[PDB]
Every structure is written in C-alpha cells, then in structure tokens.
Amino acid sequence: RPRGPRAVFILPVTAQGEAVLIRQFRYPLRATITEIVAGGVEKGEDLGAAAARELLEEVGGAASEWVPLPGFYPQPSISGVVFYPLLALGVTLGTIERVVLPLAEVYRMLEAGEIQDGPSSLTLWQARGELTRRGLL
C-alpha cells in the first residue's frame, strides 16, 4: 500500500528564542555537523506524532506549539524520499551533542554559509518569516 518513505525535520525554539541544535557524527564526513532535529517517520505514524517523538528522543524536548512548513525532496534526482519540516515553539528541555544557541547567532551562521547541512539550512530559511513576525528573531 503505497506511501513513500518520509522523515520529519524539526527546528526547536525555546520561550527564550534559542534554537535547539545537535552536532551529530556523520559517517560520510567522518566528522560531526550542526543539524536541526530529524528522524524517519514510522509505519503507523502520523507526521505530528513522529515529530514529537523525535524531539523527545533526540534532545529531550517538548513543544508548546507546532507550525508545519513546506515539505521538500532532498535529492529528487536519485530518491523519492520527502522531508517534512516543522517549527516547534515554546520548547522545554529536561554520537549526538545538544547545542543551544540564540536565534540571532544561528541566522548569522546561516547567512555566512556556516550551516552546510542542506535540509537544516532550508528549514531555517523557511521558518525565518514566522520567527521574525513573532519577534523571536
């Protein structure tokens, strides 16, 4: 029964306007790289539910509000996978290293090219209008 593979990407932002990032070792780099939260969506999993699960499991986070952002294909030339980005707000926090930075610094990094992870960079760009409107950025 066709539903293609899916992963959810979450930009988690605290009440204080900090992004919750991770530095995750990636084998094709033999190095770590700065990323937002992400993971595959399970068989019987709704997008909303995969997102909360991943936020909990990867950074020990929970969100007060979820804002869905436009889905995209990370590599449509070789793969049918779809990445679904979400902005998580009001986030509280109880291989991978968690990295909490003020949003102004994250967007300075973004503009400078220092965020080389494509899916994370695209999510940050898509969330930017929302964060500016709320005065978080």
User: What is the contact surface with its own copies in residues (CB under 8 A)?
Assistant: 26, 28-29, 33, 69-80, 82-83, 111-113, 115-119, 121-122, 125-126, 129
Considering the complex, state which of residue 73 and residue 90 has its C-beta at the smaller distance from its own copies: 73
What is the smallest separation between the CB atom of 88 and its own copies, expressed in angstroms?
19
**Closer to its own copies at the Cβ: 80 or 135?**
80
Smallest distance from the beta carbon of 135 to its own copies, in angstroms?
Answer: 19
Minimal distance, residue 16 CB to its own copies, in Å: 25
Orientation of helix 118-133 relative to helix 103-112, angle to 10°: 130
Other CB atoms closer than 10 Å to residue 7's CB: what's the count?
A: 17
Rounded to whole angstroms, the Cα distance separating 71 from 9 reads: 10
Q: Which residues pair with 18 in a beta bridge?
A: 102
| Shortest reach from residue 18's CB to its own copies, in Å | 22
Among residues 54 and 117, whose Cβ is nearest to its own copies? 117
Q: Which is nearer to its own copies, 14 or 37 (CB)?
A: 37
Cα torsion 129, 120, 100, 60: sign = positive
DSSP state of 27: T
Nearest Cα residue to 17 out of 116, 106, 85, 118? 106
